Design an enzyme around this catalytic site. Structure first.
Site, PDB file in Angstrom:
ATOM      1  N   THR A 116       8.419 -37.970 -32.450  1.00 21.65           N
ATOM      2  CA  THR A 116       7.127 -37.345 -32.568  1.00 21.65           C
ATOM      3  C   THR A 116       7.308 -35.833 -32.713  1.00 21.65           C
ATOM      4  O   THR A 116       6.588 -35.164 -33.478  1.00 21.65           O
ATOM      5  CB  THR A 116       6.331 -37.624 -31.318  1.00 21.65           C
ATOM      6  OG1 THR A 116       6.060 -39.050 -31.234  1.00 21.65           O
ATOM      7  CG2 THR A 116       4.960 -36.849 -31.342  1.00 21.65           C
ATOM      8  N   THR A 117       8.256 -35.321 -31.943  1.00 23.34           N
ATOM      9  CA  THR A 117       8.435 -33.869 -31.848  1.00 23.34           C
ATOM     10  C   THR A 117       8.950 -33.350 -33.206  1.00 23.34           C
ATOM     11  O   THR A 117       8.584 -32.265 -33.609  1.00 23.34           O
ATOM     12  CB  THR A 117       9.423 -33.584 -30.765  1.00 23.34           C
ATOM     13  OG1 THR A 117       8.819 -33.950 -29.542  1.00 23.34           O
ATOM     14  CG2 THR A 117       9.677 -32.050 -30.601  1.00 23.34           C
ATOM     15  N   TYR A 147      11.070 -47.193 -29.167  1.00 24.01           N
ATOM     16  CA  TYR A 147      10.307 -45.995 -28.781  1.00 24.01           C
ATOM     17  C   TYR A 147       8.913 -46.461 -28.483  1.00 24.01           C
ATOM     18  O   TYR A 147       8.132 -46.745 -29.407  1.00 24.01           O
ATOM     19  CB  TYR A 147      10.350 -44.998 -29.927  1.00 24.01           C
ATOM     20  CG  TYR A 147       9.584 -43.672 -29.737  1.00 24.01           C
ATOM     21  CD1 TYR A 147       9.095 -43.264 -28.491  1.00 24.01           C
ATOM     22  CD2 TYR A 147       9.379 -42.850 -30.807  1.00 24.01           C
ATOM     23  CE1 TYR A 147       8.381 -42.061 -28.353  1.00 24.01           C
ATOM     24  CE2 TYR A 147       8.689 -41.651 -30.686  1.00 24.01           C
ATOM     25  CZ  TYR A 147       8.225 -41.265 -29.460  1.00 24.01           C
ATOM     26  OH  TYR A 147       7.539 -40.097 -29.377  1.00 24.01           O
ATOM     27  N   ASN A 148       8.600 -46.569 -27.210  1.00 20.10           N
ATOM     28  CA  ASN A 148       7.313 -47.040 -26.759  1.00 20.10           C
ATOM     29  C   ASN A 148       6.379 -45.860 -26.465  1.00 20.10           C
ATOM     30  O   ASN A 148       6.606 -45.059 -25.540  1.00 20.10           O
ATOM     31  CB  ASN A 148       7.468 -47.955 -25.509  1.00 20.10           C
ATOM     32  CG  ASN A 148       6.138 -48.577 -25.099  1.00 20.10           C
ATOM     33  OD1 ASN A 148       5.512 -49.238 -25.913  1.00 20.10           O
ATOM     34  ND2 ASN A 148       5.636 -48.266 -23.878  1.00 20.10           N
ATOM     35  N   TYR A 149       5.344 -45.729 -27.275  1.00 19.77           N
ATOM     36  CA  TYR A 149       4.433 -44.600 -27.088  1.00 19.77           C
ATOM     37  C   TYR A 149       3.010 -45.110 -27.307  1.00 19.77           C
ATOM     38  O   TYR A 149       2.488 -44.904 -28.399  1.00 19.77           O
ATOM     39  CB  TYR A 149       4.798 -43.494 -28.093  1.00 19.77           C
ATOM     40  CG  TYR A 149       4.099 -42.143 -27.896  1.00 19.77           C
ATOM     41  CD1 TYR A 149       4.441 -41.074 -28.676  1.00 19.77           C
ATOM     42  CD2 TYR A 149       3.103 -41.957 -26.930  1.00 19.77           C
ATOM     43  CE1 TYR A 149       3.799 -39.793 -28.506  1.00 19.77           C
ATOM     44  CE2 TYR A 149       2.477 -40.663 -26.706  1.00 19.77           C
ATOM     45  CZ  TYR A 149       2.856 -39.596 -27.530  1.00 19.77           C
ATOM     46  OH  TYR A 149       2.272 -38.335 -27.400  1.00 19.77           O
ATOM     47  N   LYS A 199      12.855 -45.641 -25.017  1.00 23.49           N
ATOM     48  CA  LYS A 199      12.269 -44.404 -24.578  1.00 23.49           C
ATOM     49  C   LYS A 199      10.794 -44.728 -24.306  1.00 23.49           C
ATOM     50  O   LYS A 199      10.058 -45.095 -25.206  1.00 23.49           O
ATOM     51  CB  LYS A 199      12.366 -43.338 -25.687  1.00 23.49           C
ATOM     52  CG  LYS A 199      11.495 -42.095 -25.453  1.00 23.49           C
ATOM     53  CD  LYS A 199      11.420 -41.328 -26.761  1.00 23.49           C
ATOM     54  CE  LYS A 199      10.526 -40.109 -26.513  1.00 23.49           C
ATOM     55  NZ  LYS A 199      10.553 -39.274 -27.775  1.00 23.49           N
ATOM     56  N   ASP A 200      10.365 -44.552 -23.071  1.00 21.06           N
ATOM     57  CA  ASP A 200       9.010 -44.900 -22.646  1.00 21.06           C
ATOM     58  C   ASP A 200       8.193 -43.634 -22.423  1.00 21.06           C
ATOM     59  O   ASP A 200       8.342 -42.936 -21.411  1.00 21.06           O
ATOM     60  CB  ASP A 200       9.075 -45.656 -21.313  1.00 21.06           C
ATOM     61  CG  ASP A 200       7.807 -46.389 -21.007  1.00 21.06           C
ATOM     62  OD1 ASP A 200       7.603 -46.766 -19.817  1.00 21.06           O
ATOM     63  OD2 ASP A 200       6.950 -46.630 -21.914  1.00 21.06           O
ATOM     64  N   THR A 201       7.318 -43.361 -23.381  1.00 21.22           N
ATOM     65  CA  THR A 201       6.455 -42.211 -23.309  1.00 21.22           C
ATOM     66  C   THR A 201       5.120 -42.644 -22.825  1.00 21.22           C
ATOM     67  O   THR A 201       4.317 -43.128 -23.600  1.00 21.22           O
ATOM     68  CB  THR A 201       6.272 -41.570 -24.671  1.00 21.22           C
ATOM     69  OG1 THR A 201       7.500 -40.964 -25.035  1.00 21.22           O
ATOM     70  CG2 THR A 201       5.293 -40.319 -24.563  1.00 21.22           C
TER      71      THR A 201
HETATM   72  C1  LIG Z   1       9.734 -38.267 -28.006  1.00 21.08           C
HETATM   73  C2  LIG Z   1       9.389 -37.401 -26.803  1.00 21.08           C
HETATM   74  C3  LIG Z   1       7.870 -37.831 -26.540  1.00 21.08           C
HETATM   75  O1  LIG Z   1       7.426 -38.964 -27.350  1.00 21.08           O
HETATM   76  C4  LIG Z   1       6.846 -36.771 -26.899  1.00 21.08           C
HETATM   77  O2  LIG Z   1       6.675 -36.161 -25.591  1.00 21.08           O
HETATM   78  C5  LIG Z   1       5.442 -37.335 -26.712  1.00 21.08           C
HETATM   79  O3  LIG Z   1       4.730 -36.146 -27.059  1.00 21.08           O
HETATM   80  C6  LIG Z   1       9.647 -37.655 -29.339  1.00 21.08           C
HETATM   81  O4  LIG Z   1      10.014 -38.396 -30.297  1.00 21.08           O
HETATM   82  O5  LIG Z   1       9.163 -36.473 -29.459  1.00 21.08           O
END
Ligand SMILES: *[C@@H](C[C@H](O)[C@H](O)CO)C(=O)O
Ligand SMILES: *[C@@H](C[C@H](O)[C@H](O)CO)C(=O)O
Ligand SMILES: *[C@H](C[C@H](O)[C@H](O)CO)C(=O)O
Ligand SMILES: *[C@H](C[C@H](O)[C@H](O)CO)C(=O)O
Lengths: 293, 293, 293, 293
Positions: free
Chosen positions: A42-43, A129-131, A154-156
């Site tokens: 996302t970043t 990547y769980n968001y 990765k659990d956001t």
């Molecule tokens: C992952 C880190 C988190 O998903 C961001 O904090 C959510 O804003 C990324 O891929 O940036």
């Protein structure tokens, strides 16, 4: 546990990836002790990148390091498969994908089929990547168990119980939090680390938090985690994704170009206000010898 | 009021747009009384189409009709501006965008800028496609007024107070509901009509609910609205966006090929089970002379 | 369709029910054309009332009129049962209850049992008071059908599709919206009316919107509905439940004492700012001869 | 850190508090190493208790131990003030209140005034019971600092970032989590403990998790935490508040009578089914020498 940076994507004023700014940033992060880089997260504005641009990101960062998790997901499965296959020629840590985004109320069966398809063609370990907030759906510990092919997640999400459940239902999975605010806690509680957007601009802080927590200096870890929380909160005032560019310049000294609109850059008035929110923190960090200046 | 169809995008077996199939569908919709066609909407899998595919869709449907609202939005603002500009040589009704999706917590300022930019470059009226659940953000009547350049809005939200507020705050604005379940109610209550996914497969029903309600035949409008609601509900069992293809073939007699994975086609058994749910409803509609055989 | 007032409970300066002011309020509502009075509702602060006070409110209103729905719900099933039973000597329209509030994750079975228990002992018809935001749970059209004993429902929700479904699934049920903003719509779409908080202070406006919609003068009904909406909105600024007291005195000319802390009275400045927000509207309604002045 | 039990209120067949059963349970909890008892909390069905019953719980529990936090809140502020002033003669730890529940959209100013009012009359330390899902309102670390008079907080929320924030903004405040599932984590990360519903029935498990975590045996603490989580999940099948009664008699060997409807008791069959779900866990606990058999 590890600190992993979801690396920012520098764009030029022509709205192209600035590979040379990307490599400088990646070299610095590795030099300051970041374990691995999450590319097209996302970043890094991954959902705003075409498949070709996702690959371009991988290539440039791969010039610096093979410590890479390569995010390849999207709403065209054929493109995600192609990226997954293309990664065969890179000696990296893994590929990853968020859940198909935008469309609400996708069936469990379709979501599982999407991920198992990526697993089937993947020449590397596959990370979830769980968001939920961004994608509109949750792939929790039980669904991850049902998918059955994840090396890590990765659990956001604002729910650490949810994050611990990955470990409880899947003992051999690597389990990371997507929060900068949870570096001390995650290292204290037996989790595997943090994919921390703030490690872009303060890699020193995030590494030192994790170090202190490992040493069981919990009060010291928390003191520093709570200063880092104030920087996270200042970044959110004008939009964290945009603010991350400004803070990386401020703290690390090199710039990262522009974001890609409709992620717009902070204007002059916003930058000034952001800096006034963090210059005192920056002073404290130099005092503490975490930052040089 | 009007019934506008967010037209389905038919894909071939190898994941390209089936342009001839799309023209057949479009022509049938217009001939069955649909007022305009909303191209590259959610039902059309607009977020899954590259900009070039979004343009292809406009060119195919344009061979059939100029009654078109052309959706151009996305996470690369240079691409949406390019699509907006390219629409100048098509004598259409208007262009449209949903809000930038995926990224949570984008500021009011930034969302406002995104939409004002599209209006600055648009050779046609601009329509707001407001869809909070899919995009993660809400462009309400107040924000619509501040953007200040919209001709109309499609509001996909279950809250009719929210939709009515567009008209309250912007008296000149055309205001459509994104719901199939609200056709009778929208028509009764002084709003401008519906952009209805289910009119893809049952245009006769959605046109007739509108007319009944236009003639103040509310109990009858509701009777038929309540039948149509059962079909919407059945379409949701295996995933409405996938199910729309099956229903269109079933009710209209021609097929629309495949959706694009990860919007996966129903399998044979799901198709069969779906048909069982809507058989007795097809029978009621033939008997009511809304459908032929 | 009906307008039903969920009547305000005026408290004295020492925090007791002011019976005399409540009778004066009830007489005026009935005189001005309100159909029925919903007693111990949210607007009446029902959850802040002991079972004795909930009986006291009934006794007082019943001095004025038979046209009462008696809300009896709470977290002690024995008290609710006792209030249900005591209603046998009152010739009222019905009793009502919201779902048990506060405790989250209550099972469907335990919710059905609570309402069936009340239906079992009720000497009068039983009305569902559905308010998911306040109570933490939803008792939807299918659950109401399962419970099987409701004569009607008040649905306080921002989703008219949800309200319509009660009519769809239970054709003989009386179905009211808990919204002031939906009076024109509900009358135009075949629903049974509105239990409208705003009819405490503008019963004349609520009755007129309803009449105009009934006569199919939808643009006139909307214009009036939209003016009413501005009053609702002003009332939310410092808290609707507290503001309703101030507005009723402002528009209807008699005092209704105090709400019960922690629903705190407006202070002098809040009250002044509130009147300033609706004084232009009061003028317009006088000019339209809706208010006599 | 501490384990604090939000003690169940046992009721007789005729829906009154069973004082003698309460005393036996209180006594057993203390003997098994529970630090403090939180009285009239959610687990003790405090919102279902009149002010008289809340006071009766305090008196019975006070016969056993003075290590009591006395929860007094409700929707009549006079009654909560009264309970607070009545606690003067008891040498206990503190009083507590949740936020005023049920009513949505209460202003920050009104929430603050509610708590400061209780603070101004309190003869003991005052604890915040923060429970957003149940009460509808969040009293976050910032609002807690604004109120300014809390000695500590019980935060019942899954987001541990939110709980750590109380410590961050209020370094002298005692900070507890309301989760049974976060006992190992809370102890590990430098928070003050948990107010844990499951400590009613497995006090020995909750105190051992805490001790293992304290000893930095994280893996061992998590193993036990993960077993404890399974009992919590089991308790949720038929409704946790009702199930807590059945689990306490099962694991601790004495009974706690009946809950108060609409918290309805489990039936014989539901009890059998719940026991079958936790039997195998009990065997694990015996094998770990946590429980005898
Ligand atoms: C992952 C880190 C988190 O998903 C961001 O904090 C959510 O804003 C990324 O891929 O940036
Ligand atoms: C506090 C403990 C928590 O509030 C619950 O365990 C979660 O509902 C209580 O007072 O019962
Ligand atoms: C408009 C119709 C609504 O947006 C969808 O039906 C909601 O799923 C469209 O663009 O498809
Ligand atoms: C009914 C009115 C609505 O339920 C509430 O005003 C919604 O806040 C009542 O009993 O007040």
């Amino acid at each position: 546990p590890e600190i992993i940076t979801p690396i920012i994507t520098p764009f030029t004023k022509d709205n192209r990836i600035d590979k040379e700014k990307l490599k400088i940033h990646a070299e610095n992060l590795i030099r300051k002790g970041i374990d691995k880089l999450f590319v097209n997260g996302t970043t890094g504005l991954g959902p705003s990148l075409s498949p070709e641009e996702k690959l371009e990101n991988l290539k440039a960062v791969y010039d610096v390091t093979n410590k890479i998790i390569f995010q390849v997901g999207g709403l065209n499965l054929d493109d995600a498969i192609r990226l997954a296959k293309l990664s065969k020629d890179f000696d990296i840590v893994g590929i990853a994908s968020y859940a198909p985004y935008y469309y609400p109320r996708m069936s469990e069966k379709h979501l599982v089929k999407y991920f198992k398809t990526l697993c089937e063609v993947s020449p590397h370990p596959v990370y979830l990547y769980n968001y939920p907030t961004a994608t509109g759906k949750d792939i929790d510990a039980k669904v991850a168990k049902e998918i059955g092919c994840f090396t890590g997640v990765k659990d956001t999400i604002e729910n650490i119980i949810h994050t611990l459940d990955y470990k409880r239902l899947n003992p051999n999975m690597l389990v990371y939090s997507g929060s900068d605010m949870l570096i001390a806690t995650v290292a204290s509680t037996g989790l595997d680390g943090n994919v921390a957007a703030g490690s872009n601009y303060l890699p020193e802080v995030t590494v030192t938090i994790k170090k202190l927590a490992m040493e069981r200096k919990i009060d010291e870890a928390l003191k520093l985690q709570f200063l880092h929380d104030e920087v996270i909160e200042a970044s959110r005032i004008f939009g964290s994704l945009s603010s991350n560019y400004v803070l990386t310049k401020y703290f690390q000294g090199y710039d990262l170009g522009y974001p890609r609109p409709p992620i717009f850059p902070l204007d002059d008035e916003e930058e000034r206000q952001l800096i006034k929110k963090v210059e005192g923190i920056r002073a404290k960090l130099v005092e503490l010898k975490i930052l040089k200046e």
